[PDB]
Design a protein around this ligand. Structure first.
Ligand SMILES: NC(=O)c1ccc[n+]([C@@H]2O[C@H](COP(=O)([O-])OP(=O)(O)OC[C@H]3O[C@@H](n4cnc5c(N)ncnc54)[C@H](O)[C@@H]3O)[C@@H](O)[C@H]2O)c1
Ligand SMILES: NC(=O)c1ccc[n+]([C@@H]2O[C@H](COP(=O)([O-])OP(=O)(O)OC[C@H]3O[C@@H](n4cnc5c(N)ncnc54)[C@H](O)[C@@H]3O)[C@@H](O)[C@H]2O)c1
Ligand SMILES: NC(=O)c1ccc[n+]([C@@H]2O[C@H](COP(=O)([O-])OP(=O)(O)OC[C@H]3O[C@@H](n4cnc5c(N)ncnc54)[C@H](O)[C@@H]3O)[C@@H](O)[C@H]2O)c1
Ligand SMILES: NC(=O)c1ccc[n+]([C@@H]2O[C@H](COP(=O)([O-])OP(=O)(O)OC[C@H]3O[C@@H](n4cnc5c(N)ncnc54)[C@H](O)[C@@H]3O)[C@@H](O)[C@H]2O)c1
Lengths: 335, 335, 335, 335
């Protein structure tokens, strides 16, 4: 009858997905996190260093989290197979722990009673979607587990779609200047799988690998072989920026680029891709719900066919809203 | 014949204790850390965001860490009982993992072949020592496991000793404005045992409990019931400052306070307590080996009997040097 | 018939005083700042790194700043004597440049047409006020020029008043752990009058002198000779915290301290002094309009007569709201 | 007979140029700065938040700054014409105030007695030099006033030269992720000429214009029309990184790119361009004297003819050392 949502992992994304659900009237029926009990959940949800105090009521009772008088069941189980999703009636599940990324890992949610899973990160094998770019590729009859890609992919892909469709991208290389995240360390500590990521997050500019640019070629297949990139993690707690250097097939004077993006933002990519000519900086996008905000004045062209395009994204807040948008879209298709 | 040292936990303290050992000619025969293999140890030891590149050679071979041509065995075991300390001849062990704080937990090192253990943190029951204040209380014949207290206790106790012995402390309350540490989080995350400590370390001033002031009354028994305090964690990666507000029994004009501290620094507390009248800030003490650096100009008196005294400490580097000093002292007593 | 406000200095306080005026329905008729033209004022007012985008419309036309359709004259003169306050009909002027602090300096506003002046900083000779503590000492007949004291004094004085009147303060020493401000430097630079203040604000814990605690004894004369203190500037961009260590005459068990502050917050100091028992950190007070938020759990007592009390303040936002409250109060009295 | 140096502007570059002079045995005979007297110069030179305490003696007497027993005259004049350079016998002058960038402005140093001037910043008309790239274009007879370009240009040009001469650069776009500097603000403040630069430096990723990439085409004329770029200022106090995305004429497999850079670093560009394959982050280059350190592992190729190349630089320290190198080179040529 209605979209209902379960959240596994009540972290930055989990908690802000709940905020976005409340904002968009999406019913959340349960949250699972073995490291956060109901009373502690109230505290973590209510106070946020980055996005301020929750505007509304947050309480706990009867083993439940209660937000704006909406009662939410709280589970404390460590593995998807163990979560009693059936107890709250076959919800759509957001998998936002960061550690159950494969179809096999996520499918345990379905076994445990979930109707669908949205993995809030790229997956090695789950079908990947970026709202505004390829959500139409979703087939309810054949797909119960999907990925909403990464924050960076959701920033680049809408922009790349507009630029490629208007001018043709011959080749492009991306850099994201990216806020630090929960995977990083306060001071130099162990990060066996990726040594640089262990170094103090607040002290350093840290180069990092990312598949985000290549992932864009998954949701825009015409761009296979034509995009890749990397990241720098820097000492800001939220908001990131994509820096796309691309060679274009058709001449693209910068004024034409601006008109193409502005047209997309006003029309078919409204709410996903935005456009600004203001003298903005990263904090100006705290709480912004867009996937991608094109920065007209920040970019620079060498010539009509070789340009550097700049687009902002609140990697926490924009992405969380896209998770909710994908859920709502999936539900609209699954009737 | 000679002091030999094993380090359990190759973290901020573990690695800087190794630096201090190399600087002071103390032989380190082994390091244990299940999360850092020899090649990775080379990297973590060589590069440091806070204290710069190691000045010397760092290599690995034959399963060993080699620093300035000194070969160091590397073990990868998760529990003290499992570490083959016997294989490197009954070393003195630095327990710097942060999770084996009790006499019972640390005693497994002895069972595994260690001759002594120095816990690099306060212990609920191990005898506690602050160099320059009460190391004489150490008895080799009855004590195989000891604690070197905390960075903050090592800052406050030498100062409190000088002030109490000259003027008499009637009562005192301490605040430490303290750099963030590895126990904290880059962004708002779970900290069940202490909620505030979960909040983003780089964004916040964070109140925290600390037993450091009360611990001073353990090493200066005359001050039992007369000292306690608390902490603020702030967005700096290293160096902290003690803020001691105390009522004194004898009149203590600030000039007399300065002369007492200066006399102690030049004489019996040389190398432990230092004295400055310069316009210093926290970064000026990066790499400082003193336990406590009295800041003459920063303090303020209401009157001759009620004063606020300020003292700096490199919570990483000073403390690591005191660990080494305690080891050397213990060895000198144990012959 | 109505209060009208002119703002000299469109900085952090000037701009946030304008926000507070909009929030409280106070008519602002002019802003003077020689370094910010109308178009640039729009930008600086609309976007804020700390307090977010202005929720409303901001535009310029006809040499005026227009906020939520309210037309505001913009002047560009470098000295108070030169500002054409008469052109907007004898406004109450907020002096928030930071460089006209004396009665003599500020009085040039009056000669230029201002009805009254509120200096948004302590003054060497202008009478100082803290709302909720001594505004009733305002005398319209004789006080054309007043001072709203400092952010820190507005935090400490309400708390000091409650504690003194309930328990009697014998003596106290204050530390404020304080966010950096516009007077500080991004990297080590010149600060002739105060050397430590030149050192990089984002890298350092910086001791600083402040007259804030002594200033409390001016607005609460019964505390003359009983308070002083100092500051540490730390790497946060806004929100600060008072750390008051005091000796009390009457027995002051911490439970009794909490009931006294709670009662004050609910009654005579409502909207000025708040009370919390939550596990708060500095960012939880971004945008808070209170002068002082008592942190029950952060404080610690040595005994019934010697305690450390902790209270938060948004040094930008709370203080700006108090400027507006003082303006409104003065106006109601000048009738 | 010998090189003697005068420094105008005792800021980050002025002070670290003095450090580099001491390190390289270059005689500094005078420093001019109207905002820093001899006693204050001692303090600012001795203590450094970024690069640590000066390892040596620093004192003042007889109106002079004395470093390692070298007596340095201290002048306090506000304009180049007014500085008594003649009193110290026709020194080579480093113009590091940031406000005398043209040949016309800087030439007043010559009228005041200077032998030559090195502007420590790009100039609109003074010839620009990058050591290791085009110092041989220096012509003593006709060039009294020169520019050492920018920190960023000194990073990019050596790399661009190596890559162009080996593979041929068809076109390239540069981003520098750059530490904040003294021109920026601690909190949102006025920056009329460049609005984004006024926004809080420690809170924001800040896009900025830079002519650095185009400047490379001035010192490497064969690249005219083939390079431009932009900057992001981020919350680190020192060390920056160049991100060069270029299209290459000859096939440039990444292995061949590494051999070309490595060979340059070992030979013709030794001490200017370095090469590393370690997992480095920005703080690992604090105090590094190279203009450019190529980060082999950080870069990524889309294909053999389209690559992203990453190179580090200590924008303060490396550049200061290059100023000294240019002075010495000019002197050897003026003989
Ligand atoms: N923070 C961002 O900018 C961002 C943006 C897009 C996607 N993501 C992705 O979202 C996912 C979560 O990222 P995050 O930033 O919220 O990290 P996070 O650390 O803040 O949140 C992870 C949460 O999952 C909990 N958790 C850990 N193991 C669990 C388990 N077995 N079962 C249930 N809960 C568990 C943790 O207690 C924590 O609260 C990751 O895959 C991340 O890559 C993050
Ligand atoms: N950082 C400071 O300022 C400071 C000062 C004084 C004392 N201490 C104390 O020193 C101890 C370590 O602190 P830290 O800052 O170095 O933390 P840290 O996280 O940087 O180091 C801990 C190290 O121990 C390793 N480790 C974890 N579990 C282990 C296990 N079972 N066996 C072996 N190694 C293990 C970790 O891999 C890590 O390298 C703590 O008790 C701390 O309270 C810290
Ligand atoms: N920021 C705080 O936390 C805080 C709190 C309370 C009080 N104050 C005090 O308020 C006053 C301003 O502080 P601030 O933080 O807003 O500093 P600020 O630098 O942000 O604001 C100063 C403003 O005044 C402008 N200005 C400079 N000279 C001027 C002149 N002759 N005429 C007109 N305008 C001029 C500047 O362009 C700037 O916009 C200071 O006295 C400060 O001590 C600051
Ligand atoms: N800091 C860097 O990373 C870097 C690198 C390369 C080049 N530069 C350039 O070097 C120059 C200085 O940069 P900075 O970072 O040292 O800035 P800075 O603010 O730290 O130094 C400027 C110094 O010049 C002084 N000064 C100001 N006006 C003066 C005057 N008329 N006469 C004499 N002294 C005066 C100031 O007191 C200050 O000490 C600038 O042109 C800058 O673009 C900076």
């Amino acid at each position: 009858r209605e979209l209902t949502v379960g959240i596994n992992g009540f972290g930055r994304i989990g908690r802000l997905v709940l905020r976005a659900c409340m904002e968009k009237g999406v019913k959340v029926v349960a949250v699972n996190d073995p490291f956060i009990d109901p009373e502690y959940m109230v505290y973590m949800f209510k106070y946020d260093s980055t996005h301020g105090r929750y505007k509304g009521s947050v309480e706990f009772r009867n083993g439940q989290l209660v937000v704006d008088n909406h009662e939410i069941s709280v589970y404390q189980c460590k593995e998807p197979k163990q979560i009693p999703w059936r107890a709250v009636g076959s919800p759509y599940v957001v998998e936002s722990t960061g550690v159950y990324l494969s179809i096999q890992a996520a499918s345990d949610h379905i076994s445990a009673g979930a109707q669908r899973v949205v993995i809030s990160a790229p997956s090695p094998d789950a079908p990947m979607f970026v709202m505004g770019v390829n959500e139409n590729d979703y087939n309810p009859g054949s797909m119960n587990i999907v990925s909403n890609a990464s924050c960076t992919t959701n920033c680049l892909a809408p922009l790349a779609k507009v630029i490629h469709e208007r001018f043709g991208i011959v080749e492009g290389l991306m850099t994201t200047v990216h806020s630090y995240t929960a995977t990083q360390k306060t001071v130099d500590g162990p990060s066996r799988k990726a040594w640089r990521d262990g170094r103090g997050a607040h002290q350093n500019i840290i180069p990092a690998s990312t598949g985000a640019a290549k992932a864009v070629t998954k949701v825009i297949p015409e761009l296979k072989g034509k995009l890749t990139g990397m990241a720098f993690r820097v000492p800001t707690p939220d908001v990131s920026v994509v820096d796309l250097t691309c060679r274009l097939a058709q001449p693209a004077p910068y004024s034409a680029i601006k008109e193409a993006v502005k047209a997309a933002a006003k029309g078919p990519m409204a709410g996903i891709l935005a456009y600004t000519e203001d003298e903005v900086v990263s904090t100006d996008f705290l709480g912004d719900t867009h996937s991608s905000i094109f920065d007209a004045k920040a970019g620079i062209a060498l010539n009509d066919n070789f340009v550097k395009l700049i687009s902002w994204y609140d990697n926490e807040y924009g992405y969380s809203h896209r998770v909710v948008d994908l859920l709502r879209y999936m539900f609209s298709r699954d009737k």
